[PDB]
Amino acid sequence: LAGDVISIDKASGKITKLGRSFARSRFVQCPEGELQKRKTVVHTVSLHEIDVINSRTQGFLALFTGDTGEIRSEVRDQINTK
């Protein structure tokens, strides 16, 4: 609705409501500067996460549910080379 503060990602189409602006007529501050910003983010991914992801028998939910279940050494060799 009008009065909202939102962030739009053009490539993936993800729209997030940061909240409402300062308009008495939650509450956040209206952003400053250019609308189209370019930001650099830094990711730190453990080797176990890539081992779980690269093993096709289970998804990333085994990182949270915990049933990784005896990950083989071949995908460990592929991750160690890559």
């Binding site: 500067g33 250019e34 609308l35 189209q36």
Partner: protein
């Protein structure tokens, strides 16, 4: 000498009313000025009269058939002030601009009558 240098060429490069290079008979007719804007209109109405007479004859090579068709790809958008890539368009005066400080220095405090001249270059008024 400077005020007679032009007169020397004037008395060298003249031709009288009994023109040597023209014919013996002249019979010069009267003509209107016939500006180029209305020439297109009278050619168009002559051609339209020809189709509406012949119908109640496909044209092959006319003035209105040789002119270029509009494009199929979408047109690129550029900044009206700098000529760079225009990312944003102001909602008040409909001027495409590049970044924030261009909007603050030029696009916002501009006088009326200037935006129509900026839009005249791409013909958007």
């Amino acid at each position: 000498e400077r005020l007679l240098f032009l007169r020397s060429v004037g008395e060298r490069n003249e031709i009288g009313f009994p023109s040597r290079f023209k014919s013996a008979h002249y019979k010069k007719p009267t003509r209107r000025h016939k500006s180029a804007r209305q020439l297109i209109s009278d050619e168009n109405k002559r051609i339209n009269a020809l189709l509406t007479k012949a119908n109640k004859l496909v044209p092959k090579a006319t003035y209105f058939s040789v002119e270029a068709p509009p494009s199929i790809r979408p047109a690129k958008k550029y900044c009206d002030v700098t000529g760079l890539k225009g990312f944003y368009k102001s909602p008040t005066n409909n001027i495409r601009y590049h970044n924030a400080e261009i909007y603050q220095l030029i696009v916002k405090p501009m006088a009326p009558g200037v935006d129509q001249e900026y839009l005249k270059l791409r013909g958007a008024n």
